[PDB]
Structures are given as structure tokens and as C-alpha cells.
């Protein structure tokens, strides 16, 4: 009864830690999904960046040779 009051105190300390770890899990899980999305954008753009670069290498040699 007073034990029950000690138990409510233990519940309160526990509930704050539990809500923190639950939101921390969500924030960590969100950061991982955000990073994977960022990875996917860079990975998807990597051919496009490679495509542009290859054209730029062809453009570099061609435009120099034409002006030469």
C-alpha cells in the first residue's frame, strides 16, 4: 500500500526511460531510413554523374582537338 506507492514511483521512473528509448528507437530507425534514401539518391545519380563525366571526357578531347 505504501509498497504500492513505492511501486507507482518505480513505474514513473520506468515510464520515462521507456518513452525515451522508444522515441530513440524511432529516431535511430528514421536516421537509418534517411541515410538509405540518401544512399539511393547518390547511387542512382552515380551512372548519371558517370555519364556526364564520360561525355565531359569526350567533350574535353574533342573541343581541344577542334580548336587545335
Amino acid at each position: 500500500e505504501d509498497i504500492l506507492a513505492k511501486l507507482k514511483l518505480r513505474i514513473q521512473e520506468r515510464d520515462e526511460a521507456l518513452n525515451f528509448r522508444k522515441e530513440e528507437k524511432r529516431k535511430l530507425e528514421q536516421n537509418i531510413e534517411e541515410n538509405k534514401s540518401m544512399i539511393a539518391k547518390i547511387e542512382m545519380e552515380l551512372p548519371n554523374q558517370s555519364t556526364k563525366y564520360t561525355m565531359y571526357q569526350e567533350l574535353r578531347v574533342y573541343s581541344r582537338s577542334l580548336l587545335e
Binding site: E1, L28, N35, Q49, Y56, R60
Partner: protein
């Protein structure tokens, strides 16, 4: 010192360097981000492991609190309600019981 203080193709040169630095910086970001992503995933397993054990303990706390609270409720308990309660408390939670 005096003379040097007074003292098309540049854009072609500067643009290929500019684009390649874009590629390399994006590439290094990709490599480092993948490693960091695996580190966060491994850390997430430690969070799940630690919180998972606490969730099990939290259920135990709710059981003793709710059962004694229902027992505290203003109705006369039967004798079997008392015996089953202390059997449950003593057997399931011997450490907390003592």
C-alpha cells in the same frame, strides 16, 4: 615585386576538374555513409536488445501492481483469491516477495 604586383580554355579546364571533384566528394560521402549506416544498424540492435529486456520487466511490474490494486478494490476477497495470490506472488516473484 612592383611588376608582379601590377601583374575560353580556362572554362574548359576548370569545368572538368569541377565535375570530377563533384563525383569524388559524392563517392567518398557514399562510402562513409554506408559504413555509418551499418554502424547505426548495429547500434539499433543494441538498443532493441536493451529496451527489449526492459519491456519484459515492465510487464512484470504491471502484473503485481494491477493484481494487488484489484485486490485492494473495495470487495471482500474470497479465501481462494488470497491463497492463489500468495501462491502466485511467492512462486513467480520470490525475490520481490521477500
Amino acid at each position: 615585386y612592383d611588376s608582379f604586383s601590377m601583374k575560353l580554355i580556362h572554362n574548359l579546364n576548370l569545368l572538368v576538374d569541377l565535375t570530377e571533384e563533384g563525383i569524388r566528394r559524392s563517392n567518398q560521402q557514399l562510402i562513409s555513409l554506408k559504413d555509418q549506416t551499418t554502424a547505426l544498424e548495429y547500434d539499433l540492435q543494441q538498443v532493441q536488445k536493451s529496451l527489449g529486456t526492459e519491456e519484459q520487466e515492465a510487464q512484470h511490474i504491471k502484473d503485481v501492481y494491477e493484481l494487488i490494486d484489484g485486490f485492494s478494490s473495495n470487495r471482500s476477497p474470497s479465501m481462494e483469491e488470497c491463497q492463489e495470490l500468495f501462491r502466485r506472488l511467492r512462486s513467480e516473484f520470490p525475490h520481490e516477495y521477500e
